[PDB]
Ligand binder design. Sequence first.
Ligand code: CLA
Ligand SMILES: CC(=O)O[C@H]1CC(C)(C)C(=C=C/C(C)=C/C=C/C(C)=C/C=C/C=C(C)/C=C/C=C(\C)C(=O)C[C@@]23O[C@]2(C)C[C@@H](O)CC3(C)C)[C@](C)(O)C1
Ligand SMILES: CC1=C(/C=C/C(C)=C/C=C/C(C)=C/C=C/C=C(C)/C=C/C=C(C)/C=C/C2=C(C)CCCC2(C)C)C(C)(C)CCC1
Ligand SMILES: CC1=C(/C=C/C(C)=C/C=C/C(C)=C/C=C/C=C(C)/C=C/C=C(C)/C=C/C2=C(C)CCCC2(C)C)C(C)(C)CCC1
Lengths: 33, 732, 65, 91, 30, 161, 80, 137, 67
Amino acid sequence: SFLPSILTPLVTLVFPGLCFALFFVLIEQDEIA
Amino acid sequence: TKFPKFSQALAQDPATRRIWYGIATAHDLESHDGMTEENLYQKIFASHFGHLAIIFLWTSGNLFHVAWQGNFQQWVLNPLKVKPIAHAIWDPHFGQSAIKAFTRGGVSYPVNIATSGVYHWWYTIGMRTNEDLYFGALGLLILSTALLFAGWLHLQPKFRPGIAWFKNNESRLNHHLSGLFGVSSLAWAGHLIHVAIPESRGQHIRWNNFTSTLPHPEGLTPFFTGNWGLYAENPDTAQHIFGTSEGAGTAILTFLGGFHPQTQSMWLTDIAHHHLAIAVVFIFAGHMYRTNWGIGHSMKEILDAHVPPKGRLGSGHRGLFETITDSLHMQLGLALASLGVATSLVAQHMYALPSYAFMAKDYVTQAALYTHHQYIAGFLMVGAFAHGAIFFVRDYDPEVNKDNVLARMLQHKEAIISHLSWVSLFLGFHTLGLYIHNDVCVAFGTPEKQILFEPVFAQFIQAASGKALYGFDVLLSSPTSVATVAGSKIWLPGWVEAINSGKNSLFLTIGPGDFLIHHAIALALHTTTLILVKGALDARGSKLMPDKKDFGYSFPCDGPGRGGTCDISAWDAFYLAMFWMLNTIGWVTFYWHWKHMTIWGGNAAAFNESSTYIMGWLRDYLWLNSSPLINGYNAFGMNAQAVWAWMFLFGHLIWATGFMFLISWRGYWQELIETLVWAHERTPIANLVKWRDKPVALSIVQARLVGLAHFTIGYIFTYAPFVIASTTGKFS
Amino acid sequence: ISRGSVVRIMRPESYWFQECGSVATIAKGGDRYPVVVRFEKVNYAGVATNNFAMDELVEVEAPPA
Amino acid sequence: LDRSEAADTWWGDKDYPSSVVLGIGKDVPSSIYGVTSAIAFSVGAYCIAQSNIINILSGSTVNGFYVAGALLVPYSWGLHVAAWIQKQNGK
Amino acid sequence: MITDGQIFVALCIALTAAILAIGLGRQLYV
Amino acid sequence: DVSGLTPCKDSAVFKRRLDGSVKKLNSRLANYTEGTPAYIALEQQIEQTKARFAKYGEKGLLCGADGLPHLIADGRLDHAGEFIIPGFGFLYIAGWIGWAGRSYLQFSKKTDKPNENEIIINVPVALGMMAGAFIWPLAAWKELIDGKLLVPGDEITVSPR
Amino acid sequence: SHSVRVYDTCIGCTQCVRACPCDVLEMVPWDGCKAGQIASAPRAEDCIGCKRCETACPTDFLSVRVYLGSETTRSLGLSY
Amino acid sequence: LLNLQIPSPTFGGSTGGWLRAAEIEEKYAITWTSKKEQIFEMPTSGAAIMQKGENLLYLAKKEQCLALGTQLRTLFKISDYKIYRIFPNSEVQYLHPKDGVFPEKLNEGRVGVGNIGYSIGKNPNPVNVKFTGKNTF
Amino acid sequence: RIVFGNDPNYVVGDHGFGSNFLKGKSEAQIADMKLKELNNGRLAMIAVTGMFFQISIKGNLWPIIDG
Ligand code: CLA
Ligand SMILES: CC(=O)O[C@H]1CC(C)(C)C(=C=C/C(C)=C/C=C/C(C)=C/C=C/C=C(C)/C=C/C=C(\C)C(=O)C[C@@]23O[C@]2(C)C[C@@H](O)CC3(C)C)[C@](C)(O)C1
Ligand SMILES: CC1=C(/C=C/C(C)=C/C=C/C(C)=C/C=C/C=C(C)/C=C/C=C(C)/C=C/C2=C(C)CCCC2(C)C)C(C)(C)CCC1
Ligand SMILES: CC1=C(/C=C/C(C)=C/C=C/C(C)=C/C=C/C=C(C)/C=C/C=C(C)/C=C/C2=C(C)CCCC2(C)C)C(C)(C)CCC1
């Protein structure tokens, strides 16, 4: 099928990259005032 | 509101160790800021729900992938020739040669050959088509959805259970033994009798007709009349073929024993009877404790009044109920020890008494499963001891355990540690000495001088179980024995032929190599227990550091004063015993794999001759069987084992990288990072990009953890390719 | 206990716990730990003497005569 | 069951345990305990012998009333321990 | 032979599980 | 006979091993001439090999399927010489060594300078302790009965429990 | 920051203060000891945790004791 | 408090000095007096010449300042060193000889901080302080 | 949302569907009507359960649904 081509890059490159970006930004968020 | 919100200290921490310590203390809920016992228990409950959801998602994923991309239907027709498929490969880095090589298993696309035995398990329990696997995957997905909803729900205000409910031990133990164990095992017996035996006998019983189809021609009339032998009457014949009605019986509950001849696996009727009987025993066991009615037992009363006369065991078991029901670490340690023992038991029993059809001839799956479960058993045992140490350093109250059975352990810990040291030293000295003696004797061309000790006691136990080649003629090996006479009519007629048949792994023949390797295993177990016991008992304090409990479980050191205090925290005794866990399980798996490879090849004389010396171990097991792995890819081409070769060298690399963290320590790297900080701050252009957390070298405990993880992961990722690729290449 | 005597230490945290030592000096007045017990067995730091309280010591052999 | 809802049964100082450890059987006389223990042990041994030794146990035909009674051997052990406990308690 | 529609309904159930997992994670964080 | 083994006298594999070793040496023998030191040394080698095999056959050792001696260590006196007699011999020698060490330590502590007595051994009395340790099983029993073998329990440091 | 504590087994040897490389410790008057002084840690925030005080302490077990805790720039001793 | 115009030692420069953190979090200064112009070793790598009379030096760590003070005390016998912490707001906090004399010498104006009234091995167990914000000392 | 919400004014079994008739009636009458609803539902829970089983095992109800 075409689901492997559609999903493997989506879930192994785009999603983990966005997760790393989100985690980095969140850990670098400073205290509220 | 930094990332470690649970730890204000780590939040105020300005270096990069904040991230590391927050990640590694995220699940240490007991030490979190502003934490209460009730909230701790509720959060643990929710995390348990999430974990169960993850397990069921993993199972559903395996089932779905086999259903969608696996050749289950083709494998069902010819189990002994078709190779089971795990899942398809999607890799844009593969070359045409790689795609061609990985195209296998009677499919038109690259695939991975399953080595988990899931095909055999599902075929045995009665899965015949991809539709059944898909519907099972859907059911498991719905179950995971329900479990996630439950985990969310039980954190709500009106649905948050209380501390008394959590600490209700009697009701939990009653239900988790009578329902979770007992009724679940009864349900599995029902599944066997309703779906698995008919499918093995050539009947398609599914949800649309299981109501109409009777498991037995008699029905429940024998059950209600008490003529229960009707369900054992007419067993399966020795000419039965699995999955076909020819040679099929009508018995649903039997005690034939032995093995099904075609599949060389245990009878499904025997397995159903097993689960039914043990379900009955568990349901009876689960009515022991007092819950809301009057009948039952009080565990506090039992423990309190179990004290032998004249203070033999001090005050007895007084206070143990309080310590166990208050400390979660003691409960965790007991559970981990029990589960590690159970994992070792399943590893030892699956190969000796295979239960799934055609698994005995699937050599790769057997070795993979044995190695897998033995490694997990070692991990669980080390975890049990580590959490016992944490309980001692965190949750132990001497006032409660005033002269307790637990306090006397601390009283004579010096004697315990000294005797563990003695037995470890004796075993190591003499095992290594005999091995080196045999090595030198064979090296000087005179093998006749070897000190070869026959494992007479193990051979005696085999004879007592029913072996006859040794000629001991004791108990079941003796035809005249009262034990043989008593058992002659139920299970011995099958068991004797099964054990005496030489084509089986049930009670393998043993010799001097088995003697020596068993004593090596005893050495390794005793040394691991020495390290772990010393850590647990010295966690509270020592002569070099009586106030260790104030510092806690995992601290770096006490400084160079008093001669040096490296690795004193009793977390470092986990760290140091993990090496011995890997060592002992490696020895065990080497022994299993070689003794089974030779027997599969019909060349047991090679093991019996070469296993008595370390050069033979290095030459005839590692060097000999490493060829098909390292030849996975070479200058002339590549095979399907190229992935396994890559991984062998990758595990080698990870194992070697662990040595860096384990050998080189923090000051060198801190100075190096200071130089790198200077360079980054002083270079132009790049100095505009500036960190937020000050870079620092990894902490002492952090780097011990990282090096140990590299060591362990390299260990497993370099042994798994060997044990799978060599077995696959030799097919024996 | 007394000067010149041999006393067994009872402080749990001491390196010489439940070991004998020769009393070398008893300080009068202040000195929460007035006895000064000298040992022949060096601890990990290397010192062979330490101060102790009255109740932390047990008399086992009186001084000579 | 809560920690408070539990009688004090510890008896390390004493030479014998209190009769509270027997639970419902705390009031049972020692003579009755001993004679019932003897009867239970005899009956259980007889049942096991007739199930397994005198007749070799056949899967097709097992009595069931011999399987029952075989459990009385542990019951006989408990009964004679309780007989001793009541004798030392003078009850 | 598993059908495309079968894979799609299984994917929908998986997405529902994903939403519930996100909710459970949020509730565990708070 | 035990565990399916057989004596090495009537062991075809044992005899084959003997002939193989003899044939290997006699082959290596071809390089050297008659009467040379190497030739006579190889003749000694062959004689010692044959003597070893004959002695192993005569001693009653059990030879397995691999054709090598197997030692039985369970307690049977038919095979006492394998473990029981060497075991008692080692136990006597090891107790001799331990008793000599212990008695020398007991002496050296009473000395004015025990720390220097440990690294510079008073050999005249040390040899005396080595000699006197020959009767250690009776001496150990006597000291145990007199309460001088074991130090009591609360006179030995123990760490904070 | 780390927590520096001084117990009453002190004997006023003033060697912990000498071993101190950050001026965390100082002698203050006291009654219990014959020397009339006891170590004290009024500047624990400057502590780095090298435990030279503990190394230099001659008591059978340490009168001066340092418990490692929350890390800061000063405690980590980062020049950057 | 501090003059901020004292002549500094003659030094040819080094890469061991403060880097972008002393000017934004906190710097340190140490001022002393020398009887003769003479060569000494910096806590950072290098050799400097302390001038005759007053001398002022900048550093990045109280540890560095104390190390230089110890060097001056046990080599050149200069015990007039005083150390300050300089914030980016230019607030100056005089730190090391706080009472005017070194910590080793006893003074009556010092109050005990972090002094415990019992021996070391009498602290409460961790189980006692479990689920509480206090610690076992 | 109103099930698992924190609405303090929420009455159990008050979703607003057809609630207009309860405006006229009095609180005693409201309790009587809610009790009648609960009793009817309680009966139906058991009835239905029977029905389902009768259709499953017999294939027909006794007094109605002859075949
Ligand atoms: C409901 C569950 C169940 C069922 C349907 C069967 C069915 C069968 N069993 Mg049984 N069996 C069971 C539970 C069950 N078993 C349990 C729990 C055990 C103990 C582990 C056994 C142990 C067993 C053996 C060893 C053998 C059988 C055999 C048989 C066959 C004939 C038995 C007969 O005629 O008994 C008729 C009996 C009755 C109608 C009355 C039974 C009442 C019991 C004794 C009540 C008390 C139970 C007790 C408290 C539970 C704990 C066990 C205790 C005995 C130790 C038949 C296929 C034989 C067979 O198939 O051989 C090929 C055989 O050899 N069974
Ligand atoms: C827009 C709109 O609509 O707004 C709504 C709003 C609102 C408020 C919801 C309204 C309402 C009211 C509603 C919805 C009312 C619904 C009422 C309904 C539908 C009530 C069924 C009861 C059934 C019972 C008790 C069954 C018993 C069954 C039993 C006990 C049996 O027969 C047993 C038996 O069968 C067995 C088991 C087996 C057989 O062998 C034998 C028999 C047959 C004897 C409004 C105002 O009207 C309109
Ligand atoms: C075809 C189709 C479609 C689409 C679909 C899609 C788009 C899908 C997707 C899917 C996906 C994409 C999925 C995913 C999933 C996931 C999951 C299922 C996950 C889970 C997880 C978990 C379970 C976790 C857990 C945890 C952790 C790990 C951490 C934290 C904590 C917790 C516990 C939470 C539509 C609808 C249009 C229509 C119909 C059909
Ligand atoms: C530190 C600590 C801890 C831990 C611990 C551990 C980790 C342990 C383990 C342990 C173990 C892991 C053990 C085991 C054991 C075992 C045994 C003891 C066995 C037995 C057996 C038997 C008795 C058998 C018998 C038989 C039968 C029945 C049949 C056949 C034959 C025979 C004879 C074999 C805790 C947490 C508690 C806490 C405290 C502290």
